[PDB]
Swiss-Prot record, chain A:
Protein known as: Spike protein S2'
Phenotypic consequence of residue 4 to L: In strain: Eta/B.1.525
Chain's role: Subunit of the fusion protein that is processed upon entry into the host cell. Mediates fusion of the virion and cellular membranes by functioning as a class I viral fusion protein. Contains a viral fusion peptide that is unmasked after S2 cleavage. This cleavage can occur at the cell membrane by host TMPRSS2 or during endocytosis by host CSTL. In either case, this triggers an extensive and irreversible conformational change that leads to fusion of the viral envelope with the cellular cytoplasmic membrane, releasing viral genomic RNA into the host cell cytoplasm.
Domain of life: Viruses
Length: 49, 70
């Protein structure tokens, strides 16, 4: 995520990274955890598109 | 970890992330380390535990619990 752009890089689990984006657009973070599988399937299919 | 079970229901931190030093579990803001005691009024509930991945076991302390007997 943004830490390296800030400066010295910091590792973070990827799902945690996705959580804070949804925090950034106002949606509560529980949605990501409850529908991770659908989100992943859509992302891969979009790569196919 | 992403979340902690208390009793059937799940809990999520209002801001920051959950951290552990091996001894116990705490919550902190992401830009400056300053651990805090996990309380009721730092998290909120949504859904059930079976949905989420990576959840762990602990107990949430209620500040009102030791004083409700008064
Ligand atoms: C290995 C270690 O340092 N454990 C300490 C623990 O004894 C203490 O209760 C806690 C709260 O300050 O911080 C940590
Ligand atoms: C290895 C282990 O202890 N798993 C337990 C599980 O048996 C229990 O159903 C759940 C809720 O009590 O918390 C966890
Ligand atoms: C993290 O990856 C390892 C390797 O597969 C896995 O064993 C572990 O279960 C994963 N973490 C969680 C919380 O499942």
């Amino acid at each position: 995520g943004w830490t390296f752009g800030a400066g010295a890089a910091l590792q973070i689990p990827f799902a945690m990274q996705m959580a804070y984006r949804f925090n950034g657009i106002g949606v509560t973070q529980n949605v990501l955890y409850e529908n991770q599988k659908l989100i992943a399937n859509q992302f891969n299919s979009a790569i196919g598109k | 970890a992403p979340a902690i079970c208390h009793d059937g229901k799940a809990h999520f931190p209002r801001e920051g992330v959950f951290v552990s030093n091996g001894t116990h579990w705490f919550v902190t803001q992401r830009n400056f380390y300053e651990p805090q005691i996990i309380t009721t009024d730092n998290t909120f509930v949504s859904g059930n535990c079976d949905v989420v991945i990576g959840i762990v076991n602990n107990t949430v302390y209620d500040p009102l619990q030791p004083e409700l007997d008064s």
